[PDB]
């Protein structure tokens, strides 16, 4: 309460540009803070390039709370969202 259950989720199945940039940002800030990486580095050292790889290999364990104007919200895991951008 309030929320919205996983079944009946009416919002966009695709990730917004604003969602992507906010996710890539937070993960880059996480990596820079010496946080554990969830993908085998390919001679990478930049926190954004690594976060970008983590999103590409769908292993970013962050969640997005989409707020509807009534106050209600829909929780979407980065793992389920589509990146057609």
Partner 1 sequence: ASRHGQKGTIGITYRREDMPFTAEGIVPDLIINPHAIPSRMTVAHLIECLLSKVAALSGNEGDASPFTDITVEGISKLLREHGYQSRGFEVMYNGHTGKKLMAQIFFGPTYYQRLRHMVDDKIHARARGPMQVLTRQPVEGRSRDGGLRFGEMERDCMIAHGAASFLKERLMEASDAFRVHICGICGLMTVIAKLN
Partner 2 sequence: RGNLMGKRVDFSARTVISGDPNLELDQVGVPKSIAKTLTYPEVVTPYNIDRLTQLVRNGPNEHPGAKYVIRDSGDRIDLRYSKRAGDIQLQYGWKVERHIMDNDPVLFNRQPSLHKMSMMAHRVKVIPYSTFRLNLSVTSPYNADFDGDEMNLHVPQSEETRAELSQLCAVPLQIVSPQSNKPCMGIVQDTLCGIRKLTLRDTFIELDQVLNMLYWVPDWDGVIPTPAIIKPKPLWSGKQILSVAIPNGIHLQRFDEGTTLLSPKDNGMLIIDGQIIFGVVEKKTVGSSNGGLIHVVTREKGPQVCAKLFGNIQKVVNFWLLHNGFSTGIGDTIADGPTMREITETIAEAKKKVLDVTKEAQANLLTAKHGMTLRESFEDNVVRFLNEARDKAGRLAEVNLKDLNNVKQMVMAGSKGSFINIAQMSACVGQQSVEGKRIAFGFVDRTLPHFSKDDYSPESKGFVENSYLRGLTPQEFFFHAMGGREGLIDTAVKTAETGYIQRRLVKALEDIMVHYDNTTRNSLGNVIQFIYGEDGMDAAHIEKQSLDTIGGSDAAFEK
Partner 3 sequence: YDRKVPSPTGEYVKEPEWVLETDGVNLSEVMTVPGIDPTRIYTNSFIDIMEVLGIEAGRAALYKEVYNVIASDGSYVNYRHMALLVDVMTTQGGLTSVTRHGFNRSNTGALMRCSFEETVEILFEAGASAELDDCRGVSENVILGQMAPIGTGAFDVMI
Q: How far apart are CA 11 and CA 8, in angstroms?
A: 9
Taking CB under 8 A as the criterion, the residue among 7, 65, 82, 84 binding partner 3 is: 65
- Min dist CB 73 to partner 2, Å, is 9
Site for partner 1 in 17-36 (CB under 8 A): 17-18, 22, 25
Site for partner 3 in 22-61 (CB under 8 A): 22-23, 26, 61
- Min dist CB 42 to partner 3, Å, is 26
Residue number with CB closer to partner 1 (16 or 44): 16
- Nearest CA to 32 out of 23, 20, 22, 45 is that of 45
12 binds partner 2 (CB under 8 A): yes
CA dist 39 → 26, 31, 48, 64, 79 (Å)? 16, 12, 13, 21, 14
């Amino acid at each position: 309460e309030k929320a919205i259950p996983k079944d009946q989720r009416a919002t966009t199945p695709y990730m917004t540009k604003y969602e992507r940039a906010r996710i890539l940002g937070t993960r880059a800030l996480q990596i820079s803070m010496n946080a554990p990486v969830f993908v085998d580095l390919e001679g990478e050292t930049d926190p954004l390039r690594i976060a970008m790889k983590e999103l590409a290999e769908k292993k970013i364990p962050l969640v997005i709370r989409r707020y509807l104007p009534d106050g209600s919200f829909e929780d979407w895991s980065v793992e389920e969202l589509i990146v057609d951008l």
